[PDB]
């Protein structure tokens, strides 16, 4: 998929994830994990979620 790589400070959107339809800034990107941490506040608490690069596609 095009633009599959993400960086700190990039919009994300997951079809099966709950952090879509709201603003999303990622936490950490790890190549050994093959997945990236996304830090979106939930009821005002920042929460990291690990999602596969093919699984999450930016808007």
């Amino acid at each position: 998929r095009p633009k599959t790589l993400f960086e700190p400070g990039e919009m994300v959107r997951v079809n099966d994830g709950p952090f879509a339809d709201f603003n999303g800034v990622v936490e950490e990107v790890d190549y050994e994990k093959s997945r990236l941490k996304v830090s979106v506040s939930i009821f005002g608490r920042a929460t990291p979620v690990e999602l596969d690069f093919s699984q999450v596609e930016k808007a």
């Binding site: 506040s41 009821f43 005002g44 608490r45 920042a46």
Partner: protein
Amino acid sequence: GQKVHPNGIRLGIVKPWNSTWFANTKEFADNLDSDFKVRQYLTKELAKASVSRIVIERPAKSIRVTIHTARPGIVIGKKGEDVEKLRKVVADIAGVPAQINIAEVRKPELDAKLVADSITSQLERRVMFRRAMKRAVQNAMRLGAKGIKVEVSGRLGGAEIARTEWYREGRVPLHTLRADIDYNTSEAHTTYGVIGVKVWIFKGEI
């Protein structure tokens, strides 16, 4: 040093916490320090407003407080302006956005911080200590709950030897963990030394 803190022993059983947030290992110490700084500033600014309890709940994007005041008109000022300046300065003290919530407390003679602070202000104003704790005990008993005990210790009446003198009415069971006892202390700082106030109030059993 015989007696344990009543709030401390029944914190697990009946009394909720003065700070009810969650944090991990890394954020715990700095969250405690921020809570200390915001509570210190609120108490310093609102000692004339006589706040009893400052309940702090942090979502961990912002921080909200539930401050308890006998006169909410003093803390809101005019049209919420004093609340607005206090919210802004407590926000840029804490380094994180803030929401201030104020709960009007009922029975100010039946809550212990304001009883102890009133006795402290009377010892600043050199009211005699026997009349101070006698009025506190009789007013709490006529206004409400069936337990009252006020202990005032240290340099009583300008003496060179400190004494501990306590009045008590009703029933105040400290050993029963079912009891609703609120313990709060306040220190009065006279010209000849410092003098401490210990107040128990027993609401009932839960």
